[PDB]
Amino acid sequence: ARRRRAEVRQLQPDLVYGDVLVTAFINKIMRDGKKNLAARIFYDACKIIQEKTGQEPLKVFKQAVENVKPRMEVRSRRVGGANYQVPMEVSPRRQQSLALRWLVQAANQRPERRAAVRIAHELMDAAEGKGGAVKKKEDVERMAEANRAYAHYRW
Amino acid sequence: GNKIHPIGFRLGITRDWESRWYAGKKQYRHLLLEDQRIRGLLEKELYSAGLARVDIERAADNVAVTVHVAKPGVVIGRGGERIRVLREELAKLTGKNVALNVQEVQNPNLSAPLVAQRVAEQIERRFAVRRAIKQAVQRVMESGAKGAKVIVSGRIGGAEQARTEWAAQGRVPLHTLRANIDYGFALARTTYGVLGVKAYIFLGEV
């Protein structure tokens, strides 16, 4: 949008947890209008969580989102001559989107073959610190903060 | 690629269908054939009387062919015999009881299908074109109407480049549904081509 503020679509609260992070994760899992299969995948994923680790069905996921949550992310700005790749800090209302989208991409590329166990082995390794999603976070926080030299463009 | 037809834009509201009858899929095409052929008889052969519209109805085998004429003196006849022969003509192409009700207009300049025909008669009578336009709008305003606009399309004045001339006095609110802008269109079939006279007459609103 260009004119107005373009306020965000208010989500739903989830059913079994009553949380708002989990519904955005349902949405990022959801492929081609299939939410009844996507949230099904997530609840099988927390079932695999309760099977493997003696933790809450939500705590490992929320801590995975926090431990994949970026702060400094790099955005391109053409400033004449060579388009610089300026770092900037991120609003948490975009950090949540970047975090959940990275979780879904790394979980779908993750070399397990079944739906909810990919997310299981991804949320375990992201809450630990050794997953593909937190690898991508460290990748972008090493693109920025080493690309800090052009940070004087706040735009 | 603009300006949709201001009868059919109104048509649901503020304006009647000019032919109103009914039947389903069985006899709609078959009614429409005779409903077009009656008009092809009339509009070709009643033009001297200057017919505006042919309101065609049928409840059950009672074809009301009520026409709207400025001067019924050559669509009725002296005491009435052209009406008789025209009803025996209307019996020839549909066998039904073709009750032909000629009905005169209340001012023959507030009716756009006859103002546009009058401009077409002027063009085919080789008159001055924009003089005819700025005269026809002025005759409409002296008859008394809220606003007029006579668009006359190309090949105008015997030329080769084909510009479109037009003139207005008053307001012609086309985009307003409640406006009741009557609309008339008439070809002009002179030597230098087809001059397409249009005329909008903004009657009383609402």
Binding site: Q12, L15, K35, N36, A39, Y43 | -
Partner: protein, 127 residues
């Protein structure tokens, strides 16, 4: 007797009849979770009664109709609320922090010529 309510959403309609009843609900001569059998968002329909916190008093016979499953579920989500509002002054001012009485008339919007799904324009040559 009947704590009746209407309900409709997305061309899925609902006639809810809240009973004075112990603990269950039903739908259209079928069981509730044998109508909505195995939807992860099935029990998002009953979310009025779990938030007017009056769930431990009401049965709900329901004739729900039309649309699809999760459209009928939101029809019920409106229906329970608009039903128990009706015999009540103070089960009313609860849903404005919940949204639970608004038809939410986001309907499947009308397909436009040239496009395919009322917004999806065709692909573009530009060449």
């Amino acid at each position: 007797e009947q704590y009746y309510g209407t309900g409709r959403r997305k061309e899925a309609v609902a006639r809810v009849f809240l009973r004075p009843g112990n603990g269950k609900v039903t739908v259209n001569g079928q069981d509730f979770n044998e109508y909505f059998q195995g939807l992860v968002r099935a029990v998002a329909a009953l979310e009025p009664l779990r938030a007017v916190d009056a769930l431990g008093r009401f049965d709900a016979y329901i004739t729900v109709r039309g649309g699809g499953k999760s459209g009928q579920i939101d029809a019920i989500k409106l229906g329970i609320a608009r039903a128990l509002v009706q015999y009540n002054p103070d089960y009313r001012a609860k849903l404005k922090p919940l949204g639970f009485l608004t038809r939410d008339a986001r309907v499947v919007e009308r397909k436009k010529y040239g496009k395919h799904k009322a917004r999806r324009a065709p692909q573009y040559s530009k060449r």
